Amino acid sequence: LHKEPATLIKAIDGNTKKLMYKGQPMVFRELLVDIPEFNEKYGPEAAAFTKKMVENAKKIEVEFDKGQRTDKYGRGLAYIYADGKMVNEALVRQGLAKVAYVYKGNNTHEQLLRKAEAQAKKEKLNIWS
Numbered sequence: 001l002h003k004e005p006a007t008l009i010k011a012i013d014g015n016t017k018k019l020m021y022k023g024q025p026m027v028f029r030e031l032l033v034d035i036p037e038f039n040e041k042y043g044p045e046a047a048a049f050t051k052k053m054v055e056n057a058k059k060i061e062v063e064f065d066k067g068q069r070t071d072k073y074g075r076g077l078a079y080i081y082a083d084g085k086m087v088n089e090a091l092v093r094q095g096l097a098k099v100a101y102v103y104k105g106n107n108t109h110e111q112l113l114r115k116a117e118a119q120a121k122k123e124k125l126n127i128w129s
């Protein structure tokens with residue numbers, strides 16, 4: 001896999017899911033995670049967590065997997081990195097998302113993320129508390 005550059009595009013409502021990739025705006029959806037929505041338990045914590053990670057990054061990169069690059073909603077499907085640190089993994093490791101949506105072809109980092117979840121569960125973090 002390859003990391004490619006992006007930048008955060010500021011949103012009116014403060015969300016940090018839209019990135020500028022090859023010069024164009026694109027909503028990205030993080031591969032391999034289920035992230036609680038704002039109104040669910042740990043929703044506000046997960047949003048604050050990703051927001052701090054992406055907004056403070058000097059460098060954002062996106063990394064496509066080997067399969068589909070966009071979903072049925074037109075969202076980019078990628079591993080998102082903030083100064084070399086993967087957002088998808090960091091959410092899971094902190095118990096702020098679960099490993100989920102594992103489709104064929106786009107599963108390169110599955111075992112890496114499942115290890116993070118196992119560690120988060122062992123430590124009773126957040127969702128696992």
Ligand SMILES: Cc1cn([C@H]2C[C@H](OP(=O)(O)O)[C@@H](COP(=O)(O)O)O2)c(=O)[nH]c1=O
Nearest residue numbers: 029030031032033034035071072077101103
């Ligand atoms: C993570 C991921 C989600 N999706 C689709 C599955 C779900 O479709 P449905 O909308 O029909 O439930 C949806 C979950 O996204 P959200 O968790 O952002 O709601 O996005 C993909 O198609 N591929 C993916 O890799």
